[PDB]
Design a protein around this ligand. Structure first.
Ligand code: A1AXS
Length: 210
Protein backbone atom coordinates (compact mmCIF):
# COMPACT_ATOMS: atom_id res chain seq x y z
CA UNK A 1 0.00 0.00 0.00
CA UNK A 2 1.62 3.21 -1.27
CA UNK A 3 0.17 6.64 -0.50
CA UNK A 4 0.95 9.53 -2.83
CA UNK A 5 1.02 13.13 -1.61
CA UNK A 6 1.51 16.55 -3.19
CA UNK A 7 4.34 18.66 -1.86
CA UNK A 8 3.29 22.00 -0.48
CA UNK A 9 3.52 24.48 -3.34
CA UNK A 10 6.48 26.37 -1.82
CA UNK A 11 8.51 23.19 -1.41
CA UNK A 12 7.72 22.07 -4.97
CA UNK A 13 8.92 25.49 -6.17
CA UNK A 14 12.07 25.09 -4.09
CA UNK A 15 12.87 21.68 -5.51
CA UNK A 16 12.32 22.89 -9.06
CA UNK A 17 14.68 25.82 -8.41
CA UNK A 18 17.29 23.38 -7.05
CA UNK A 19 16.94 21.07 -10.06
CA UNK A 20 16.79 23.75 -12.75
CA UNK A 21 19.25 26.44 -11.58
CA UNK A 22 22.74 26.33 -13.01
CA UNK A 23 24.99 25.99 -9.97
CA UNK A 24 28.31 24.13 -10.14
CA UNK A 25 29.08 23.83 -6.38
CA UNK A 26 26.93 20.74 -5.96
CA UNK A 27 29.09 19.05 -3.31
CA UNK A 28 27.41 20.99 -0.48
CA UNK A 29 24.59 18.45 -0.57
CA UNK A 30 26.69 16.08 1.55
CA UNK A 31 27.35 18.66 4.28
CA UNK A 32 23.61 19.31 4.54
CA UNK A 33 22.65 15.66 4.88
CA UNK A 34 25.42 14.98 7.40
CA UNK A 35 24.28 18.07 9.31
CA UNK A 36 20.74 16.62 9.37
CA UNK A 37 22.08 13.29 10.64
CA UNK A 38 24.06 15.02 13.35
CA UNK A 39 20.95 16.91 14.50
CA UNK A 40 19.02 13.60 14.67
CA UNK A 41 21.81 12.01 16.69
CA UNK A 42 21.87 15.03 19.03
CA UNK A 43 18.15 14.55 19.61
CA UNK A 44 18.25 10.88 20.59
CA UNK A 45 21.38 11.48 22.71
CA UNK A 46 19.57 14.20 24.70
CA UNK A 47 16.35 12.22 25.12
CA UNK A 48 18.26 9.15 26.30
CA UNK A 49 19.70 11.15 29.22
CA UNK A 50 16.29 11.26 30.89
CA UNK A 51 14.98 7.92 29.51
CA UNK A 52 17.85 5.47 28.88
CA UNK A 53 15.37 2.94 27.49
CA UNK A 54 15.20 5.05 24.28
CA UNK A 55 18.53 3.43 23.33
CA UNK A 56 17.07 -0.11 23.55
CA UNK A 57 16.75 0.09 19.74
CA UNK A 58 20.51 0.66 19.39
CA UNK A 59 23.16 2.22 21.61
CA UNK A 60 25.65 3.27 18.92
CA UNK A 61 25.38 6.83 17.62
CA UNK A 62 27.10 7.10 14.25
CA UNK A 63 26.94 8.05 10.56
CA UNK A 64 27.86 5.73 7.67
CA UNK A 65 28.51 6.81 4.07
CA UNK A 66 27.92 3.95 1.62
CA UNK A 67 28.59 4.48 -2.10
CA UNK A 68 27.44 1.81 -4.54
CA UNK A 69 28.74 2.11 -8.09
CA UNK A 70 26.60 -0.80 -9.35
CA UNK A 71 23.29 0.71 -8.22
CA UNK A 72 24.65 4.25 -8.67
CA UNK A 73 23.53 5.18 -5.17
CA UNK A 74 25.06 7.04 -2.27
CA UNK A 75 23.51 6.18 1.08
CA UNK A 76 23.82 8.28 4.24
CA UNK A 77 22.83 6.24 7.30
CA UNK A 78 22.53 7.54 10.86
CA UNK A 79 21.32 5.98 14.10
CA UNK A 80 19.59 9.18 15.23
CA UNK A 81 16.06 9.67 16.54
CA UNK A 82 14.32 8.75 13.27
CA UNK A 83 11.11 10.16 11.86
CA UNK A 84 7.50 9.26 12.48
CA UNK A 85 4.89 8.85 9.78
CA UNK A 86 3.48 12.30 10.68
CA UNK A 87 6.97 13.80 10.42
CA UNK A 88 7.26 12.42 6.86
CA UNK A 89 3.83 13.43 5.66
CA UNK A 90 3.14 16.73 7.40
CA UNK A 91 5.29 17.98 10.33
CA UNK A 92 8.69 18.54 8.73
CA UNK A 93 7.23 19.95 5.52
CA UNK A 94 5.05 22.35 7.49
CA UNK A 95 8.16 23.57 9.33
CA UNK A 96 10.02 23.82 6.01
CA UNK A 97 7.44 26.23 4.56
CA UNK A 98 8.75 29.31 6.38
CA UNK A 99 12.40 28.46 5.75
CA UNK A 100 11.68 27.83 2.07
CA UNK A 101 9.99 31.23 1.72
CA UNK A 102 12.91 32.94 3.47
CA UNK A 103 15.54 31.12 1.40
CA UNK A 104 13.85 32.03 -1.88
CA UNK A 105 13.63 35.67 -0.81
CA UNK A 106 17.34 35.58 0.07
CA UNK A 107 18.23 34.04 -3.31
CA UNK A 108 16.58 37.04 -4.97
CA UNK A 109 18.60 39.33 -2.69
CA UNK A 110 21.95 37.83 -3.76
CA UNK A 111 22.29 34.73 -1.59
CA UNK A 112 23.36 31.48 -3.19
CA UNK A 113 22.31 27.86 -2.99
CA UNK A 114 25.20 26.98 -0.65
CA UNK A 115 23.44 28.95 2.13
CA UNK A 116 20.39 26.65 2.12
CA UNK A 117 21.22 25.15 5.53
CA UNK A 118 20.90 28.50 7.27
CA UNK A 119 17.18 28.22 6.48
CA UNK A 120 16.58 24.69 7.74
CA UNK A 121 15.73 23.19 4.34
CA UNK A 122 19.14 21.69 3.52
CA UNK A 123 17.64 18.25 2.87
CA UNK A 124 16.33 19.37 -0.54
CA UNK A 125 19.88 20.07 -1.73
CA UNK A 126 19.93 16.28 -2.28
CA UNK A 127 18.28 17.12 -5.65
CA UNK A 128 21.48 18.86 -6.76
CA UNK A 129 22.94 15.40 -7.36
CA UNK A 130 20.03 12.91 -7.17
CA UNK A 131 17.23 12.18 -9.63
CA UNK A 132 15.33 10.29 -6.92
CA UNK A 133 15.71 10.17 -3.15
CA UNK A 134 14.49 7.31 -0.96
CA UNK A 135 14.38 7.82 2.82
CA UNK A 136 14.00 4.79 5.15
CA UNK A 137 13.37 5.77 8.72
CA UNK A 138 12.42 4.25 12.07
CA UNK A 139 11.40 6.21 15.18
CA UNK A 140 11.05 4.45 18.56
CA UNK A 141 7.36 5.43 18.64
CA UNK A 142 6.35 4.32 15.12
CA UNK A 143 6.88 1.66 12.44
CA UNK A 144 9.56 1.65 9.76
CA UNK A 145 8.61 3.77 6.72
CA UNK A 146 9.90 4.49 3.22
CA UNK A 147 9.53 8.02 1.82
CA UNK A 148 10.45 8.58 -1.82
CA UNK A 149 10.38 11.33 -4.39
CA UNK A 150 11.62 12.05 -7.90
CA UNK A 151 10.38 15.65 -7.51
CA UNK A 152 7.73 16.59 -10.04
CA UNK A 153 5.48 17.81 -7.22
CA UNK A 154 4.71 14.55 -5.42
CA UNK A 155 6.17 12.08 -2.95
CA UNK A 156 5.12 8.65 -1.68
CA UNK A 157 5.09 7.07 1.77
CA UNK A 158 4.71 3.35 2.49
CA UNK A 159 5.41 0.95 5.32
CA UNK A 160 8.87 -0.51 4.68
CA UNK A 161 9.33 -4.26 4.17
CA UNK A 162 13.14 -4.21 3.84
CA UNK A 163 15.68 -5.04 6.53
CA UNK A 164 14.69 -3.74 9.99
CA UNK A 165 16.78 -0.66 10.83
CA UNK A 166 16.48 -0.54 14.63
CA UNK A 167 16.27 3.24 14.83
CA UNK A 168 17.48 6.07 12.65
CA UNK A 169 17.36 7.34 9.09
CA UNK A 170 18.82 6.10 5.80
CA UNK A 171 18.93 8.55 2.86
CA UNK A 172 19.47 6.78 -0.46
CA UNK A 173 20.57 9.18 -3.23
CA UNK A 174 19.86 7.76 -6.71
CA UNK A 175 22.48 9.84 -8.48
CA UNK A 176 22.07 11.64 -11.79
CA UNK A 177 24.16 10.11 -14.57
CA UNK A 178 26.73 12.94 -14.57
CA UNK A 179 27.14 13.09 -10.78
CA UNK A 180 28.96 9.80 -10.20
CA UNK A 181 32.06 11.53 -8.80
CA UNK A 182 30.21 11.39 -5.46
CA UNK A 183 30.66 7.61 -5.48
CA UNK A 184 34.46 7.92 -5.48
CA UNK A 185 36.20 7.35 -2.17
CA UNK A 186 38.75 10.14 -2.57
CA UNK A 187 36.03 12.61 -3.59
CA UNK A 188 33.86 11.78 -0.58
CA UNK A 189 36.85 12.00 1.76
CA UNK A 190 37.70 15.42 0.34
CA UNK A 191 34.16 16.73 0.87
CA UNK A 192 33.82 15.41 4.42
CA UNK A 193 37.19 16.93 5.40
CA UNK A 194 36.29 20.25 3.79
CA UNK A 195 32.75 20.72 5.14
CA UNK A 196 32.08 18.21 7.93
CA UNK A 197 35.38 17.85 9.79
CA UNK A 198 34.00 18.73 13.26
CA UNK A 199 30.82 16.62 13.34
CA UNK A 200 30.65 15.09 16.80
CA UNK A 201 29.85 11.51 15.74
CA UNK A 202 31.99 8.91 13.96
CA UNK A 203 31.57 9.10 10.18
CA UNK A 204 32.61 5.87 8.48
CA UNK A 205 33.04 5.89 4.72
CA UNK A 206 32.49 2.33 3.45
CA UNK A 207 34.69 1.20 0.59
CA UNK A 208 33.36 -0.93 -2.23
CA UNK A 209 34.32 -4.57 -2.59
CA UNK A 210 34.58 -4.72 -6.41
C1 A1AXS B 1 14.27 13.09 4.91
N1 A1AXS B 1 13.99 14.31 5.67
C2 A1AXS B 1 14.90 14.64 6.65
O1 A1AXS B 1 15.81 13.87 6.98
C3 A1AXS B 1 14.82 15.97 7.35
C4 A1AXS B 1 14.37 17.22 6.83
C5 A1AXS B 1 14.45 18.23 7.84
C6 A1AXS B 1 14.92 17.84 9.03
S1 A1AXS B 1 15.31 16.14 9.02
C7 A1AXS B 1 12.72 15.05 5.46
C8 A1AXS B 1 11.52 14.22 5.99
C9 A1AXS B 1 10.38 14.57 5.03
C10 A1AXS B 1 10.73 13.67 3.88
C11 A1AXS B 1 11.79 14.17 3.29
C12 A1AXS B 1 12.19 15.42 4.04
C13 A1AXS B 1 10.80 15.91 4.44
Amino acid sequence: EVETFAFQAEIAQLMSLIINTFYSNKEIFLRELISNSSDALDKIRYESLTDPSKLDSGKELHINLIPNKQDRTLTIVDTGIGMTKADLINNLGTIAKSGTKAFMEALQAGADISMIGQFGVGFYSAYLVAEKVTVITKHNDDEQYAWESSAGGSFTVRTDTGEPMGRGTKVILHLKEDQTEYLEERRIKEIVKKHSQFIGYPITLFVEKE
